[PDB]
Amino acid sequence: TGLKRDKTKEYNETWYSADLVCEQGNNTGNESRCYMNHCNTSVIQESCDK
Amino acid sequence: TLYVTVFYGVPAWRNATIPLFCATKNRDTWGTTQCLPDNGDYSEVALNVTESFDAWNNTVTEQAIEDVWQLFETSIKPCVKLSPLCITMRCNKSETDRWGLTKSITTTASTTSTTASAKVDMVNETSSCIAQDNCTGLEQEQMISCKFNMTGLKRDKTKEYNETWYSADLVCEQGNNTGNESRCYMNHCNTSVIQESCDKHYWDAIRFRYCAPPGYALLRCNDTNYSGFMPKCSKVVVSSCTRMMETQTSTWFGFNGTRAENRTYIYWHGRDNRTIISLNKYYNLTMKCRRPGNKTVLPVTIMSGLVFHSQPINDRPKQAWCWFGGKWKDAIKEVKQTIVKHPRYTGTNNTDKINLTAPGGGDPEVTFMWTNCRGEFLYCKMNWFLNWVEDRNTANQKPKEQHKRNYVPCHIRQIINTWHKVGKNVYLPPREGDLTCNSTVTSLIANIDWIDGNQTNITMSAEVAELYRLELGDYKLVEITPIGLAPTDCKRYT
Amino acid sequence: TIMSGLVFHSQPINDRPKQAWCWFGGKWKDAIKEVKQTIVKHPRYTGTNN
Amino acid sequence: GVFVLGFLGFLATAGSAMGAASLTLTAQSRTLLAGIVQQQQQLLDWGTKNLQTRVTAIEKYLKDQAQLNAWGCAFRQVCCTTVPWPNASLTPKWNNETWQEWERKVDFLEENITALLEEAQIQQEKNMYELQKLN
Amino acid sequence: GVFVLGFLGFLATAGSAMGAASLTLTAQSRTLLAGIVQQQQQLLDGTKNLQTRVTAIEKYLKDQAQLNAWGCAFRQVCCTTVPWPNASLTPKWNNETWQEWERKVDFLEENITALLEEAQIQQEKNMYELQKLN
Amino acid sequence: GVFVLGFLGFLATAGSAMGAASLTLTAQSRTLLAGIVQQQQQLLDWGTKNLQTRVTAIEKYLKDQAQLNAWGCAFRQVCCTTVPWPNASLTPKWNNETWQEWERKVDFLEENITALLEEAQIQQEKNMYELQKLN
Ligand SMILES: *[C@@H]1O[C@H](CO)[C@@H](O[C@@H]2O[C@H](CO)[C@@H](O[C@@H]3O[C@H](CO[C@H]4O[C@H](CO[C@H]5O[C@H](CO)[C@@H](O)[C@H](O)[C@@H]5O)[C@@H](O)[C@H](O)[C@@H]4O)[C@@H](O)[C@H](O[C@H]4O[C@H](CO)[C@@H](O)[C@H](O)[C@@H]4O[C@H]4O[C@H](CO)[C@@H](O)[C@H](O)[C@@H]4O[C@H]4O[C@H](CO)[C@@H](O)[C@H](O)[C@@H]4O)[C@@H]3O)[C@H](O)[C@H]2NC(C)=O)[C@H](O)[C@H]1NC(C)=O
Ligand SMILES: *[C@@H]1O[C@H](CO)[C@@H](O[C@@H]2O[C@H](CO)[C@@H](O[C@@H]3O[C@H](CO[C@H]4O[C@H](CO[C@H]5O[C@H](CO)[C@@H](O)[C@H](O)[C@@H]5O)[C@@H](O)[C@H](O[C@H]5O[C@H](CO)[C@@H](O)[C@H](O)[C@@H]5O)[C@@H]4O)[C@@H](O)[C@H](O[C@H]4O[C@H](CO)[C@@H](O)[C@H](O)[C@@H]4O[C@H]4O[C@H](CO)[C@@H](O)[C@H](O)[C@@H]4O)[C@@H]3O)[C@H](O)[C@H]2NC(C)=O)[C@H](O)[C@H]1NC(C)=O
Ligand SMILES: *[C@@H]1O[C@H](CO)[C@@H](O[C@@H]2O[C@H](CO)[C@@H](O[C@@H]3O[C@H](CO[C@H]4O[C@H](CO)[C@@H](O)[C@H](O)[C@@H]4O)[C@@H](O)[C@H](O[C@H]4O[C@H](CO)[C@@H](O)[C@H](O)[C@@H]4O[C@H]4O[C@H](CO)[C@@H](O)[C@H](O)[C@@H]4O)[C@@H]3O)[C@H](O)[C@H]2NC(C)=O)[C@H](O)[C@H]1NC(C)=O
Ligand SMILES: *[C@@H]1O[C@H](CO)[C@@H](O[C@@H]2O[C@H](CO)[C@@H](O[C@@H]3O[C@H](CO[C@H]4O[C@H](CO)[C@@H](O)[C@H](O)[C@@H]4O)[C@@H](O)[C@H](O[C@H]4O[C@H](CO)[C@@H](O)[C@H](O)[C@@H]4O)[C@@H]3O)[C@H](O)[C@H]2NC(C)=O)[C@H](O)[C@H]1NC(C)=O
Ligand SMILES: *[C@@H]1O[C@H](CO)[C@@H](O[C@@H]2O[C@H](CO)[C@@H](O[C@@H]3O[C@H](CO)[C@@H](O)[C@H](O[C@H]4O[C@H](CO)[C@@H](O)[C@H](O)[C@@H]4O)[C@@H]3O)[C@H](O)[C@H]2NC(C)=O)[C@H](O)[C@H]1NC(C)=O
Ligand SMILES: *[C@@H]1O[C@H](CO)[C@@H](O[C@@H]2O[C@H](CO)[C@@H](O[C@@H]3O[C@H](CO)[C@@H](O)[C@H](O[C@H]4O[C@H](CO)[C@@H](O)[C@H](O)[C@@H]4O)[C@@H]3O)[C@H](O)[C@H]2NC(C)=O)[C@H](O)[C@H]1NC(C)=O
Ligand SMILES: *[C@@H]1O[C@H](CO)[C@@H](O[C@@H]2O[C@H](CO)[C@@H](O[C@@H]3O[C@H](CO)[C@@H](O)[C@H](O)[C@@H]3O)[C@H](O)[C@H]2NC(C)=O)[C@H](O)[C@H]1NC(C)=O
Ligand SMILES: *[C@@H]1O[C@H](CO)[C@@H](O[C@@H]2O[C@H](CO)[C@@H](O[C@@H]3O[C@H](CO)[C@@H](O)[C@H](O)[C@@H]3O)[C@H](O)[C@H]2NC(C)=O)[C@H](O)[C@H]1NC(C)=O
Ligand SMILES: *[C@@H]1O[C@H](CO)[C@@H](O[C@@H]2O[C@H](CO)[C@@H](O[C@@H]3O[C@H](CO)[C@@H](O)[C@H](O)[C@@H]3O)[C@H](O)[C@H]2NC(C)=O)[C@H](O)[C@H]1NC(C)=O
Ligand SMILES: *[C@@H]1O[C@H](CO)[C@@H](O[C@@H]2O[C@H](CO)[C@@H](O)[C@H](O)[C@H]2NC(C)=O)[C@H](O)[C@H]1NC(C)=O
């Protein structure tokens, strides 16, 4: 959800192979649950300057 | 033969660009942290030398604009952030329709006649115009009320409150909704988070001198013919520190100026048609502004331990207005006469063809006026004051502008950007109780526009920073170089 | 935009391009042998000379 | 105030011509004598209050004094030097010429004069050491 | 330590009488000589910042400039043309410490400084005129 | 540049022997002339930039002057002192020894010599003025 804290807005971001970890299990849905590579250890910043 | 010789203590100088120490008198919180307490000396010594001075290309002038803005940045940095309150607020449909935010008007609009009589009303303090508002009409209402939840510090439960914005502080989502509640957001909460002004800034006048560090002196051009680009001063006076300076920001005018004088001198920016005019302190050009209805403020806590000052008042007083007063029309005409004789301005000399008019509308920033007094800003149409000052044919736009009056209507905006440098957006808390602010007009912001040999305009401009160029326009900063090299036949010897 | 007034860049590309690669180039094999020869004659390195 | 007039008294000679101008040594010393006093006063109770210019106030003093120490003319109103004058057309008019009016005319070659005299003092400095070593 | 006693050795003169008082040069010079060394030591590895570090520098240049301001640098006793103020306050060189009399003159000390500053300028101006003449 | 050559000229004689070396006074004074303007130039437009080391340049300069003036030999290439030489085994070789080389040999006893002179200057300081007080 964006700055207007009253509604949602779906995007898609296309990651790479070496920047995701996916849950392994018996799920059959075509959707695969995955998280960012390193967001469960620390908060990551953006190389935001040039 | 001749040999080089070194002399120390020679009184010479040169241009320089160094920061300056600020000194202030009424330091509620800004003293001992950024500015020293004042000394209280203003003696100056005249020198029989000539030096060049500029009001726009001056280091002191440029720094003053930076320092005021820089000072304001530190004040709002620790204050609270209003990010949470950017949520849909239920609002009274019958009340937003009246001011046209929704623009949902159907049928109605019955025909009515216009009396078109008299409309030369004038007011002075003895009358009942001041006491009760009530001044010929057109001062009716300005308010809107809404609701929001805003769970507080205890992040487990909500508590619905009410806050009443103004017309120019909300943007509403038009739709085919028949419900009596009109969903409507804040003005600029989807662009950048706005932080309050939870301080005493804008609640009291700010003055502070400028003192150069040791080894640097300030020079002032005391010639009465100073215009801004004159590099030959017959009279020049050295000083240790500058005079006071008012830090009030306004459009079309400058209030509480310290450089008021019996003469209507004009400061001209020779490089183009940028201009500022100083009025006279002989006509008592005082102006008083009032807003009715004594207000209540109910602080509300958000999930940061800080407080958001709301206005749950349900009263509906008349909108703010100002009546100026004093001898105006006789005062203005002297400005036009001065322009004729001033150097430059190779234009017409017909006094009753040079006319003072507002710019061509467009953005609300330049269309309206803007005056700040004791924390609550006011913007006013100013059409009537312009209409009455010149006594022009009242065929201007709709019938609402037909009248010639000494007072003008105003409204309140609370989501205001600091006009000083570029932008931003801040929230000004509302003052409890009634406000009545009185001030003396002592300057004029105007760009003089004329393309042909006829019909020159004294066009107003909305450059707030131009005021600071009148306070220290004649000041120059010079670095002292006490080293002097001249020839001498004497040799070092042994 | 996120709930801080700031922006997070994203890559919504859907087309699939060829993977990245680098091809070096230039006379390289002749270079590394000179590096090998220098180590042989370098002081220290009490090691083989073949 | 006395300090205000005292700090502004140095420039009172700016209107006079070079020949009739009265020099004022110690002016910079007196300038910094009370500057710290004003800064110190009421201080007991971004760079303006901080050291953006306070060091610059110190820096201006040391530069000027170190300038004299480098040239070996400290604590002297006038020091004759062995260096000759440059191109002589720019002759000061000691009757009807202010210091400032002429400092700008020589400003064009001021930088070159600085370099020339610095080398001269070193050469004289070298001579002094040789004489002392001899004896 | 030697420095500790050295900084604390000057004040030993306090008990001594004015006439028997031993004037000491280098009192401030040596104090800043080692204080910078003390803070410099282990610094390689406000109080730490320049809140007060320059204040020592400011204090040093204050007295050094004052000596140069009066044109008496490095002269334990420089005679000046200034005449003495009110003669009621006369030092008792036999049984008076420096501070027992310094406080009494402190009331008029400011005027002496202001009066003496003008006197140096007058003498200063004479030197330039004599040098210019010849 | 002249400044680059000028500032680096101090070590130009570092290779020379003790006697043949030409001492260079004003090295700190001349350096403070041109080093500071490098910082000042274009500054008009954390620690290294503003105040951590900028003052350290000032602190370094005052140390030499304070150290010099505490010993009472400022503005003098050579001043004779009353203090006798310490253990004489470290006799300088005026023909085939460099200043820094010989300085490293004295560094062991450098600290002790410093203390002896400071006390010695105090004694002369007490005597020199007391004679003026005497007569
Ligand atoms: C151009 O210049 C013009 C000339 O200056 C400007 O117009 C002037 O603007 C100044 C502000 O810069 C105004 O002064 C302020 O007025 C405030 C309101 O005054 C009311 O009361 C007046 C009666 O008081 C009389 O007696 C007092 C004491 O002797 C005397 O000072 C005063 O002048 C008057 O003779 C009445 O005449 C008025 O009409 C109002 O009804 C006043 O409160 C201000 O004082 C503040 O602020 C100062 C520091 O500036 C403090 O030292 C004070 O203690 C006081 O602070 C208290 O009040 C603040 C405001 O209410 C609060 O914010 C503070 O928190 C504080 O205490 C509050 O909280 C307490 C908690 O217990 C409560 O108990 C308190 O009651 C408080 O609520 C200041 O004097 C001028 O009045 C005004 N003049 C005119 C003619 O308009 C003009 O604005 C400039 N141009 C522009 C564009 O603005
Ligand atoms: C320290 O601080 C002080 C302030 O406290 C500083 O003082 C200011 O310093 C600047 C720069 O030194 C000055 O700017 C310069 O001003 C001169 C003079 O301007 C006036 O005279 C002009 C004369 O021109 C006529 O006469 C000549 C013969 O003399 C003829 O040849 C011409 O054709 C003309 O007929 C006049 O033209 C000017 O008119 C301006 O003002 C009037 C209102 O009075 C307007 O209506 C005009 O439209 C116009 O704006 C003015 O009256 C200027 O001549 C200089 O401009 C030249 O240089 C500019 C920058 O390079 C350039 O953009 C211009 O086009 C012009 O170009 C000249 O130079 C080029 C490069 O050499 C050449 O290639 C070119 O051919 C041409 O020769 C310049 O703007 C300020 O006046 C001065 N004072 C103030 C108050 O600002 C000081 O500088 C600081 N520093 C120091 C070290 O002191
Ligand atoms: C730029 O700024 C100048 C400076 O003020 C401004 O000039 C003013 O212009 C107006 C016109 O728009 C002038 O008003 C006119 O004044 C003349 C002169 O009368 C003088 O003397 C009498 C005594 O004999 C005084 O009472 C009077 O106040 C003046 O001092 C009048 O003769 C004009 O008469 C009007 O009314 C008549 C009926 O009574 C009509 O027959 C006549 O045509 C005029 O009609 C205009 O005014 C009517 C008033 O009701 C109105 O209904 C009409 O529709 C029409 O508008 C007239 O009053 C004023 O004196 C000028 N003042 C000055 C100082 O120059 C420019 O107008 C202004 N221009 C722009 C473009 O900004
Ligand atoms: C503040 O505002 C005022 C108006 O409110 C400006 O006044 C105008 O200033 C400009 C300056 O450029 C004037 O233009 C000049 O006109 C002169 C008149 O001769 C002929 O000008 C043009 C052709 O140039 C003809 O169309 C006209 O009919 C005249 O026959 C010219 O001599 C000038 O020529 C110079 O400038 C032009 C470019 O503009 C060059 O091509 C030429 O080679 C030459 O260098 C000039 O054109 C204009 O007339 C003024 N308006 C008037 C008088 O009503 C002020 O300039 C403005 N302040 C500042 C600082 O700009
Ligand atoms: C040189 O210095 C001496 C030393 O101070 C000085 O003598 C002093 O003069 C002051 C006056 O300036 C005396 O002050 C008096 O003190 C007595 C108590 O000791 C008071 O009773 C006096 O009160 C009267 O005067 C007041 C001053 O206006 C009035 O307000 C009051 O109503 C009384 O009328 C007065 O304060 C002081 O006692 C002496 N002595 C000392 C030791 O201070 C001398 O005047 C100076 N001379 C010069 C030429 O400088
Ligand atoms: C003045 O300084 C000189 C220079 O140091 C000093 O004479 C020299 O002292 C050093 C050591 O301080 C001697 O070096 C010797 O080296 C041999 C090995 O080569 C060691 O065996 C020696 O040890 C004996 O001598 C020491 C003192 O010299 C004793 O403390 C120790 O217990 C051993 O008995 C020693 O390390 C060097 O040989 C001498 N002579 C020279 C360099 O000609 C001289 O003593 C100093 N004057 C004094 C102290 O009055
Ligand atoms: C994720 O990225 C993809 C791009 O690869 C976005 O897909 C596009 O989504 C739009 C609608 O949001 C599609 O438009 C619609 O397509 C259907 C196809 O049958 C058509 O019937 C509709 O009339 C309409 O044109 C578009 O085709 C589609 N493009 C693709 C898949 O290549 C998708 O929107 C992104 N996800 C988001 C924004 O949440
Ligand atoms: C702003 O919000 C507050 C709630 O936070 C509103 O308070 C409410 O005010 C109404 C009107 O006074 C109260 O109505 C009551 O109704 C009973 C019915 O019997 C009557 O007896 C009372 O005398 C009173 O009229 C209501 O109880 C009250 N609610 C709370 C929780 O306080 C306030 O009205 C709002 N401001 C407005 C609408 O201007
Ligand atoms: C001095 O003020 C007058 C009054 O506003 C200026 O006249 C105005 O000039 C603008 C620009 O040309 C006009 O805008 C256009 O006018 C036409 C009709 O001419 C209209 O059809 C367009 O929609 C547009 O509004 C404006 O009308 C005109 N106003 C009047 C009352 O004549 C004048 O330009 C100013 N002086 C200078 C030098 O600009
Ligand atoms: C984990 O997931 C796999 C894949 O869906 C499951 O595999 C089935 O397991 C059951 C027995 O539990 C077999 O009867 C099926 O033949 C297996 N294949 C399929 C396609 O269903 C597996 O059982 C899951 N693990 C569990 C349930 O513990």
Ligand SMILES: *[C@@H]1O[C@H](CO)[C@@H](O[C@@H]2O[C@H](CO)[C@@H](O)[C@H](O)[C@H]2NC(C)=O)[C@H](O)[C@H]1NC(C)=O
């Ligand atoms: C500016 O005024 C000063 C006086 O305040 C003038 O200084 C005098 O100039 C005359 C010129 O002949 C000399 O004879 C005097 O000796 C100068 N000093 C005094 C005290 O009068 C100065 O000349 C004036 N300069 C200008 C340009 O008018």
Ligand SMILES: *[C@@H]1O[C@H](CO)[C@@H](O[C@@H]2O[C@H](CO)[C@@H](O)[C@H](O)[C@H]2NC(C)=O)[C@H](O)[C@H]1NC(C)=O
């Ligand atoms: C757009 O809004 C108007 C006004 O709200 C809607 O007009 C309504 O139309 C319906 C029938 O479609 C009527 O039953 C209602 O009485 C009308 N008035 C209101 C207030 O609802 C209109 O239908 C809307 N158009 C849409 C949603 O497409």
Ligand SMILES: *[C@@H]1O[C@H](CO)[C@@H](O)[C@H](O)[C@H]1NC(C)=O
């Ligand atoms: C100004 O008005 C007069 C009179 O109507 C006219 O002749 C002249 O042309 C006008 N000015 C211009 C530049 O046209």
